[PDB]
Design a protein around this ligand. Structure first.
Ligand SMILES: *[C@@H]1O[C@H](CO)[C@@H](O)[C@H](O)[C@H]1NC(=O)CCCCCCC(C)C
Ligand code: NAG
Ligand code: MAN
Ligand code: CAC
Ligand code: CAC
Ligand code: ZN
Ligand code: ZN
Ligand code: ZN
Ligand code: ZN
Ligand code: ZN
Ligand code: ZN
Ligand code: ZN
Ligand code: ZN
Lengths: 7, 377
């Protein structure tokens, strides 16, 4: 992970 | 990074890539455009890496379900076949190559489980799941069993579980409702209950996996197994006199195997989209194009009507197509990972008694729907 979202 | 004025194609090394190269030579003789067919290892996990940076092949062949992910990342060109071309392929195959309502790949071939049976033990295979227990007792009186198939993977057990109404994600209008999971509805409970009763009553063994079943069938120990076209050559080798037919019905409804559609997608970064469309539509997706690939390595059932009708003189292929048409296209969405994980656990747990059918499916439903409800991290 380490990136966020949400998709 | 992608060379203009030629076509690079990636296809799994277990496919008829040499035959595909022959189709390319025909393309090159007609247009002077060179077609290179490669079969990189793990090509389908390499494609999204390289295509993201604007590199990779012009055309990638893989099972349709992987293409959902590529499309999500904007890695695939939207294709533009006209209505006349679309009418050349079975409609449901087009359903397999739609993402967000858009067509993002050309369907080529179709795979699905069928009922495979020993003609010597069983010249008249059962039309229904319900008659299999009685058949098992009769066969076992002579020390053969009715049916062995892989029970460890939802892929193999789902057709029965789904027959009376189970589903992974609701398919709506070329889109999946990721919040609509059909894992714990009465249809799935019925199917799973019947499956678990078969195991509980020793008509099947909870431990049976792919190798055990294959071994038993190919040795003539069991009258029936459930497998796909990829298994046929092993049976050819065994000299068992086998047939391939429609899956039994359950509660009057067809078994619903997942369907895999080998599809050809166009790199969004390709400068040769027109060449690829021309190659795919007018060279590969013709009787002669598919036959050239098929001769190298059998495709199985195909999406192209005219050629499927020829191949369907082989009743094993006709049966594959029939099961496919009755089946469930495999959803091409990332949320499928949560479905497989959850159902795999639910079936294991239910067949081993560790959970009741009702509780296993409830938890699976909850877990599959939860992991589908969000994305990121
Ligand atoms: C991030 O999401 C995880 C999964 O739900 C949580 O377990 C974790 O606690 C969450 N971390 C935080 O809430 C810090 C969030 C910082 C902002 C993240 C979102 C923005 C849009 C990048
Ligand atoms: C994250 O996704 C959820 C839906 O899955 C949505 O409710 C929420 O607004 C999103 N948050 C973002 C994109 O920051
Ligand atoms: C979730 O998946 C999307 C796919 O496009 C990524 O872009 C995103 O960064 C995250 O990995
Ligand atoms: C992304 As959050 C758990 O701070 O709402
Ligand atoms: C909308 As959320 C990422 O706080 O569950
Ligand atoms: Zn290779
Ligand atoms: Zn797949
Ligand atoms: Zn046309
Ligand atoms: Zn019984
Ligand atoms: Zn819905
Ligand atoms: Zn496959
Ligand atoms: Zn020919
Ligand atoms: Zn529970």
């Amino acid at each position: 992970x380490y990136x966020x979202x949400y998709x | 990074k992608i060379e203009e004025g030629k076509l690079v194609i990636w296809i799994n090394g277990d496919k008829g890539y040499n035959g595909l190269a022959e189709v390319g030579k025909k393309f090159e003789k007609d247009t002077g455009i060179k077609v290179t067919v490669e079969h990189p290892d793990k090509l389908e996990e390499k494609f999204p890496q390289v295509a993201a940076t604007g590199d990779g092949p012009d055309i990638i062949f893989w099972a349709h379900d992987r293409f959902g992910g590529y499309a999500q990342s904007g890695l695939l060109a939207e294709i533009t076949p006209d209505k006349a071309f679309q009418d050349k392929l079975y409609p449901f195959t087009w359903d397999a190559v739609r993402y967000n309502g858009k067509l993002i790949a050309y369907p080529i071939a179709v795979e699905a489980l069928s009922l495979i049976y020993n003609k010597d033990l069983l010249p008249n295979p059962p039309k229904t799941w319900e008659e299999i227990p009685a058949l098992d007792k009769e066969l076992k009186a002579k020390g053969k069993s009715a049916l062995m198939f892989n029970l460890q993977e939802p892929y193999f057990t789902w057709p029965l579980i789904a027959a009376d109404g189970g589903y992974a994600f609701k398919y709506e209008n070329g889109k999946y409702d990721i919040k609509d999971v059909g894992v714990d509805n009465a249809g799935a409970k019925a199917g799973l209950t019947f499956l678990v009763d078969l195991i509980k009553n020793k008509h099947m063994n909870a431990d049976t996996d792919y190798s055990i079943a294959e071994a038993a069938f190919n040795k003539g120990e069991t009258a029936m197994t459930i497998n796909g076209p990829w298994a046929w050559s092993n049976i050819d080798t065994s000299k068992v006199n086998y047939g391939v037919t429609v899956l039994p019905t359950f509660k009057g409804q067809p078994s619903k195997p997942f369907v895999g559609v080998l599809s050809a997608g166009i790199n969004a970064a390709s400068p040769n989209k027109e060449l690829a469309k021309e190659f795919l539509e007018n060279y590969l997706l013709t009787d002669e194009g598919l036959e050239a690939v098929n001769k190298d390595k059998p495709l199985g059932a195909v999406a192209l009507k005219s050629y499927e009708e020829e191949l369907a003189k082989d009743p094993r292929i006709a049966a594959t197509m029939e099961n496919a048409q009755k089946g469930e296209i495999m959803p091409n969405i990332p949320q499928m990972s949560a479905f497989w994980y959850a159902v795999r656990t639910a079936v294991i747990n239910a067949a081993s008694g560790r959970q009741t059918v009702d509780e296993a499916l409830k938890d699976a439903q909850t877990n599959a729907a939860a992991a589908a409800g969000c994305k990121x991290x």
